[PDB]
Structure formats: structure tokens, C-alpha cells
Design a binder for this molecule. Sequence first.
Ligand code: HEM
Ligand SMILES: [C-]#N
Length: 121
Amino acid sequence: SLFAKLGGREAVEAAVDKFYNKIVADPTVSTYFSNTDMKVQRSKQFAFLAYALGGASEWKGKDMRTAHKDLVPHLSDVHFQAVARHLSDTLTELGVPPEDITDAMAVVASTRTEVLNMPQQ
Ligand code: HEM
Ligand SMILES: [C-]#N
């Protein structure tokens, strides 16, 4: 599984932690999290990614569209690209092989339509 190739639990915990340190230091997206407990957020993101990367059987939290559709200003590709960039940079900083980063980013890309609450075509 991509989850295992990445290093499993320890690796994903490390990635999520570094990821959110970048998120809160980036004015392009940090205000969205001003009323969020970032330890709880780290917990939920790990659980979602474990599922999305093939390390967990299911995800029982909010579906991605419900989770973001009501955030304001409405999310755009500027925000999506900012978050994707932070996750990619985190994996690079953690020494993940570029080919594994590519696979992880494809998983992230697959969430775009729902995360951005866009017409499903
Ligand atoms: C890159 C793709 C993204 C993924 C996979 C993702 C995933 C998630 C997940 C799993 C949750 C938790 C949902 C729950 O409560 O069950 C969440 C919450 C949230 N996300 Fe994202 N997200 C993404 C992008 C973004 C972007 C671009 C923003 C805006 C800058 C954003 C803002 C938020 C906020 C504000 C919350 C909830 C905060 C709270 O409940 O306190 N997310 N996201
Ligand atoms: C997204 N947190």
C-alpha cells in the first residue's frame, strides 16, 4: 500500500505534524483554521489519509464536500494548490522518494472536485 511504502503510521504522523506547522504559518490558508484545535485536526487528517493511502479500511468522518463547502471565502484552486504544495514539501523534507510523492499527490488530486465543492460535471 502507498501508506506502507511511505513508512506507515510513524511516517504519516510525522508528515501530518509538519504539514500543519506549515499550514498555520501560511496566511493564504491559516485563517480558515483560526477556530480549529490543531491537535484534533492532526488526528482527523491522519485518519483520513490512512484511508486514502490504503492503510485503513474506511473513513468515518465528514465526506470532503461536506467538510469544506461552507468555509468562507469559498475555497478556490489557489487554496487547493497551497495545501497540496505544503503536503508535497513536507514529504520532500521527510525524505520520501519522488516517485512515492507523485503517487501521494495523485491521491490528493483525486479529492479536488469534492473539497472545492465543484460541479461534478
Ligand atoms: C488538499 C486537500 C484536502 C484534504 C484531503 C482535506 C481533508 C480534510 C479533512 C479529513 C478534514 C476533517 C473533516 C471532519 O471533521 O471529519 C478537513 C477539515 C478542514 N479543512 Fe480540509 N482538506 C483539504 C484541503 C483544505 C483546504 C485547501 C482548506 C482551506 C485552506 C481546508 C480547510 C479545512 C477546514 C477549515 C477544516 C475544518 C476545521 C474544523 O473543523 O475546525 N482543507 N479537511
Ligand atoms: C485540511 N486540514
